Amino acid sequence: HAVCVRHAFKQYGSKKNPNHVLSDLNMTVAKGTIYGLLGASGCGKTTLLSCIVGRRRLNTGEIWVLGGKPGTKGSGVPGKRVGYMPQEIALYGEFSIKETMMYFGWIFGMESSEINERLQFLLNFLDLPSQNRLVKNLSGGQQRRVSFAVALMHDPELLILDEPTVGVDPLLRQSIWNHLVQITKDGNKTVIITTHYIEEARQAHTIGLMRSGKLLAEESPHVLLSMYGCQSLEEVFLKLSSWGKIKALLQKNFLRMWRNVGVMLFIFALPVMQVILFCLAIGRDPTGLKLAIVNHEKNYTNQSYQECSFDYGCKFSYLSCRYLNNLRNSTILKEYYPDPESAVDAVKQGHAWGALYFTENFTDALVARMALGKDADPETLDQSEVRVWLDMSNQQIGIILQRDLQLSYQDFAKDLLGACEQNPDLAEIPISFKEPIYGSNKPSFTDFVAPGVILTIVFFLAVALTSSALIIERMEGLLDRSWVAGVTPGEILFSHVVTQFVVMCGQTALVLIFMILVFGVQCKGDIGWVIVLTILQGLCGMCFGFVISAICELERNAIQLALGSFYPTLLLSGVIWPIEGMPTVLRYVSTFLPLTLATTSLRAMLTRGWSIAEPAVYYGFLATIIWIVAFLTISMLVLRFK
Amino acid sequence: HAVCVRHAFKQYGSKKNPNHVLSDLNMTVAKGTIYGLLGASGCGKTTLLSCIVGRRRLNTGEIWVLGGKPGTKGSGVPGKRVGYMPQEIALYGEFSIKETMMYFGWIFGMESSEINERLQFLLNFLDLPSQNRLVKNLSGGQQRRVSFAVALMHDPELLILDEPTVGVDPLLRQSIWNHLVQITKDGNKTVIITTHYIEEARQAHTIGLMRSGKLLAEESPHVLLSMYGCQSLEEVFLKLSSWGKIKALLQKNFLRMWRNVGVMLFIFALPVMQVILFCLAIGRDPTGLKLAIVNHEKNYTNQSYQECSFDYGCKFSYLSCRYLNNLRNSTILKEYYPDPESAVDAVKQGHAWGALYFTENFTDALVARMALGKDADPETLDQSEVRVWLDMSNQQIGIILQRDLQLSYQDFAKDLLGACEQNPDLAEIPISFKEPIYGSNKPSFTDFVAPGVILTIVFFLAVALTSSALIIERMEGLLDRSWVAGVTPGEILFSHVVTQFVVMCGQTALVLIFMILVFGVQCKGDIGWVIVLTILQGLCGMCFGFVISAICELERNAIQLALGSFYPTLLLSGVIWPIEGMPTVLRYVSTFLPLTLATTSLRAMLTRGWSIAEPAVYYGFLATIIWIVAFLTISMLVLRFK
Numbered sequence A, B: 001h002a003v004c005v006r007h008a009f010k011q012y013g014s015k016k017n018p019n020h021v022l023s024d025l026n027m028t029v030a031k032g033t034i035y036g037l038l039g040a041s042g043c044g045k046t047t048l049l050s051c052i053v054g055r056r057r058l059n060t061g062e063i064w065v066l067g068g069k070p071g072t073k074g075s076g077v078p079g080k081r082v083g084y085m086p087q088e089i090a091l092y093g094e095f096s097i098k099e100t101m102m103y104f105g106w107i108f109g110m111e112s113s114e115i116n117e118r119l120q121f122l123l124n125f126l127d128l129p130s131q132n133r134l135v136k137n138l139s140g141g142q143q144r145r146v147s148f149a150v151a152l153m154h155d156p157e158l159l160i161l162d163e164p165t166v167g168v169d170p171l172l173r174q175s176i177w178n179h180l181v182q183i184t185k186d187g188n189k190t191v192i193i194t195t196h197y198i199e200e201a202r203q204a205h206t207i208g209l210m211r212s213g214k215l216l217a218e219e220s221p222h223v224l225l226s227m228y229g230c231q232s233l234e235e236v237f238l239k240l241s242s243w244g245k246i247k248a249l250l251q252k253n254f255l256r257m258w259r260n261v262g263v264m265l266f267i268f269a270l271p272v273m274q275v276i277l278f279c280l281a282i283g284r285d286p287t288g289l290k291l292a293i294v295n296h297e298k299n300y301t302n303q304s305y306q307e308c309s310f311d312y313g314c315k316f317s318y319l320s321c322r323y324l325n326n327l328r329n330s331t332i333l334k335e336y337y338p339d340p341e342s343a344v345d346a347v348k349q350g351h352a353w354g355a356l357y358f359t360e361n362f363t364d365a366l367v368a369r370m371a372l373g374k375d376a377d378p379e380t381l382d383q384s385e386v387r388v389w390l391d392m393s394n395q396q397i398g399i400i401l402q403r404d405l406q407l408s409y410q411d412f413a414k415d416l417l418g419a420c421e422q423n424p425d426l427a428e429i430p431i432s433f434k435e436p437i438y439g440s441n442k443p444s445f446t447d448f449v450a451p452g453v454i455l456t457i458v459f460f461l462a463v464a465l466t467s468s469a470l471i472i473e474r475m476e477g478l479l480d481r482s483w484v485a486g487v488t489p490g491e492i493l494f495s496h497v498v499t500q501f502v503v504m505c506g507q508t509a510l511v512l513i514f515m516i517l518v519f520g521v522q523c524k525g526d527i528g529w530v531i532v533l534t535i536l537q538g539l540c541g542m543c544f545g546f547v548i549s550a551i552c553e554l555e556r557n558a559i560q561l562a563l564g565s566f567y568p569t570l571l572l573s574g575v576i577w578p579i580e581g582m583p584t585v586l587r588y589v590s591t592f593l594p595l596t597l598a599t600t601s602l603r604a605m606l607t608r609g610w611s612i613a614e615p616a617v618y619y620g621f622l623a624t625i626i627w628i629v630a631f632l633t634i635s636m637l638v639l640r641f642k
């Protein structure tokens, strides 16, 4: 007895809709006999097969397949001593026919010498095309034959065929049945064909009719028609009463990405281009800001010409074209207007960003204001000033103008004296800013956001790759079919980590190279710890993919969950703005987020040069390691409750 | 003669080896007979059914079905005079049996009374559950029965069935075939049953065998056996040699979104919460910064106490505890240290942000510096200054510290003189900033990024909703099955635009109420024009969804394309940084992007109050309208060859 399913109970009930899929089964299959299984549309004939191979655990009862209980330490039924053909196609579209044959042969530990011979024989027998056409390029009716040949490659002693001939030309169905009846001539192998239409399953040695979760007929077809006095079987049925499984599986993972150009460009060429636009468009100070200057001491000749000519040594001549000489030539463009009202009108129409309006007697009232000193009069104070009207609608441009206009005066003051034999330190404010402890006197916004996007690109791209890989391949039956071949769920997960890790050290090597070596983002700290932190953040991201691909079955559902949780963090992690600006009731909450405490640690390791032994640099390692454990605990808990 | 396809011809594929699929098909069906087509591949026969219905087009071949032709307005087949049952389940999820029956009846313009009567009859006859179970909750074998019942509602004169009895028990096939032979008793109706297993082609009236795209046998079953002298058809086969359609289409659209909680939260509850975090975390100036002040005029007692007391009116007492009194109490917290070196290493350890270090003789030297004036000996200049060491690693925080310290000295100077009978105007730099034309002297970053988040939330959510709705519907066969029901492509497009417009009009009033009314973002312009511009961006976003769904056939491919184009555009449209910072060459290209010109128009309409008749404002309407036309041109061009 190859299979005994005596007294098989199985319930899918909910105490509201009790689905008694398997009420009481008494099935027995003898070695060397083809055993058909006819019934309804997968009412109980599609879960009994899964329970035979150990995919689904049985309820109270008995089971005995080949050696003993399925899925035990014998390696009886989940192994190389079985052949499984699923109801649907469970092949890889990006693989050649020969590539698929070798990949499945390596799982069973078959040498490449005999695999080629078996492949050639199978190709000749099943009139398939040459062994160079991809499975995705074959029609839907001839990849079923490829799957059938895959199930027949290793010639096991127990075949579980599920609809082996449904869309097959009967001319090449007579040959299939001849082969099936020939291989079972001796008492070596056995075939279990659970088809759907009765009329073809008549050459089998034994058949079984299944209805309402119970086999109501077991005997041979001839002692069925003779017993029930029937001219056909249809009228009978009218009964109203371990290192080889990781080398050969990593190659598949590294090939399903190379063949898909769209996936390759998304996870390798987007990070490269995104960090190029960011380093070129965000952070740099505005340049080329126009200014409408009114000079009442010179002669108005044109729009972009004033004939600014003063004297240098002493005897201050004009003191208005001299100040404009000290103006910064980088981020200020000067255009001249004839009237104070005309200049203001230009600003109101968006043709400029401000006005200056040096008065008619600025030189006379300025030299007489710094001479008298602290006993001046309101007349000279109100006629020796530059009246600036500014368009302060933009914070970042209203600050550059408000700073370059005052810095240019300090150089002007330090030039007027100093050329008149005086002490330059006299023209200063008592608030003297010494050399900064960290950074430089001219900081950049790019250096503040660059650490914030290193950990964002790496984290998100790991979630997208892991979630899609484990959802598409699970929903297509690739996990279930490969499990029957003996691939325990210990190297399926281990290989994915290795594949994810390798594709991950290549993303870090491109983001860091294109932002530190090129575009010159300062890295004052150790580059050794920067790489480790970036890699560790991603491993937290990959672990998040397991959580996403454990509660969502549909492809579209994981996208909303991934996007609906990422966006909200990243307005709380302080990537684009300092963390200090948030109110101190939500700052505490925002501290326990994934990326918030690692971004701060990476920022302090680049813009300050701190080491690991600093309570702000190692807090970013503990925070990103705890989340790895938390994400690996929720995923296990989810699978337990499902 | 209901169907005549004499001299049919069809071919497509590669130029070198075209796939001839309907080479010399000669098929003829007479009214009142159950024609039965038997094939092997299952793909060369389905195309014949599609050509018969009218979905496909022949290649130099005569056809005549029902009146004159499929697809014409004279005697067209697609409508209420044909019944289609697709190969796959083309039903709607989250729809009750009764609801889908009513919807498909309304498509055919049938009154509710007859719809209910036919629903009751079909429910009783086909052995289905009560008319309140959602279709997505039914088993695999019951959805097919529901689809068959749907195809039997309007009792037309031609039934194009495709494997209707495949997974039902024999006790039901007998009743189904009895009903099928009863309905075509008189010469009223016709049935074309294209099954796949040759056992139910015995109650038929004219069997047609199909192989290699030809009809090698078209002749009645019994006389076929008599002619070929056998006893089974299997042995014979071994012979190798318009307002009603928009109301129903709109109720369906608003129900497929209300029944899905996940979809509703993503397009309605996401932007409401997104604009709440943004208004609370990004834009606000940092507060709570700490300073390590060293005072050598008082006595060091603790870390948070110095006993700062001085003289108010005249007779300057300390002039160091007085300057600290003018410091801003909001964004600066004061901590005291005993030594200048003990307060500098505090900065190096991250415990503070700066130091002040008022010297021991600050008061005497300060009052002796402003008294002499311009003839001060250099020793007094170097002993009456506040030496500030700043942590300038952060650009944003370092700006406030450099500003709140210098601005506090202006108040200190204006308080020193003014209490000593002097004009405060004496302590002023000649660069005097008048009242700003725009900006109100207090710019905020959150007021610069808020225009541009409205157009980003609306644009992206329109792309995701439209692209993911036309891809799922089309790939499931829902669009094709509704087309056979007479629903023209112009009504599918019009019904989707109306639904999208209502959705984008409901998620626009939420991002505006929650950001302009609640969080007080200034709106100096007209609110009427802002609404139109935001809506115009939604239409532009939706029109981009048509382009993506016209070139992407897989769900996972549209996600990469949508994310692979929105990310670079958002980083080049100047949303989080002024466009003036970009290089001149890259700035020119950026202006041609969809959101680059629209964001600038909205920003000038909120922070400046400009009207429509301004070149900086109406340029955003022309830019966003050209893209609507451009996106509607590429989509039509894509469908030209597809």
Ligand SMILES: CC/C=C\C/C=C\C/C=C\C/C=C/C/C=C/CCCCOC[C@H](COP(=O)(O)OCCN)OC(=O)CCCCCCCCCCCCCCCCC
Residues within 6 Å of the ligand: A551, A552, A553, A554, A557, A558, A560, A561, A563, A564, A565, A566, A569, A594, B261, B262, B265, B266, B269, B270, B272, B273
């Ligand atoms: C003023 C208001 C303020 C804010 C608004 C409020 C609340 C919203 C806040 C954000 C809105 C949106 C989120 C976007 C969501 C769309 C959710 C619906 C998609 C999926 O949920 C349908 C699925 C998958 O579908 P599936 O199982 O495969 O269906 C089988 C049938 N074929 O299934 C199921 O039901 C199961 C249910 C799962 C749903 C989330 C389970 C949560 C557990 C842990 C998740 C996160 C853990 C911690 C995060 C760490 C932070 C980085």
Ligand SMILES: CC/C=C\C/C=C\C/C=C\C/C=C/C/C=C/CCCCOC[C@H](COP(=O)(O)OCCN)OC(=O)CCCCCCCCCCCCCCCCC
Residues within 6 Å of the ligand: A262, A263, A265, A266, A269, A270, A272, A273, B544, B547, B551, B552, B557, B558, B560, B561, B563, B564, B565, B566, B569, B594
């Ligand atoms: C804000 C946005 C608005 C305007 C922006 C601008 C321009 C838009 C005007 C039109 C938009 C586009 C037309 C695009 C294409 C029409 C043919 C293409 C797809 C047709 O299809 C092909 C397959 C699928 O077909 P296929 O692979 O060939 O067949 C086998 C099926 N598996 O599509 C896919 O998957 C695509 C998968 C993602 C590909 C890109 C993702 C991210 C790439 C980042 C850029 C990297 C490029 C190099 C840059 C180097 C660094 C500087």
Ligand SMILES: CCOC(=O)NCCOc1ccc(Oc2ccccc2)cc1
Residues within 6 Å of the ligand: A253, A256, A257, A260, A263, A266, A463, A464, A465, A467, A468, A469, A558, A559, A562, A563, B556, B559, B560
């Ligand atoms: C070895 C694996 O190779 C594959 O064949 N992987 C295919 C998956 O590729 C995708 C990439 C991005 C994407 O989009 C998002 C975005 C957010 C959340 C989730 C998905 C979906 C799929």
Ligand SMILES: CCOC(=O)NCCOc1ccc(Oc2ccccc2)cc1
Residues within 6 Å of the ligand: A556, A559, A560, B253, B256, B257, B260, B263, B266, B463, B464, B465, B467, B468, B469, B558, B559, B562, B563
């Ligand atoms: C008419 C009612 O619609 C539905 O019944 N549900 C589908 C809408 O929900 C989705 C949400 C996100 C998503 O992901 C993306 C993202 C970018 C591009 C394309 C798809 C796809 C679909």
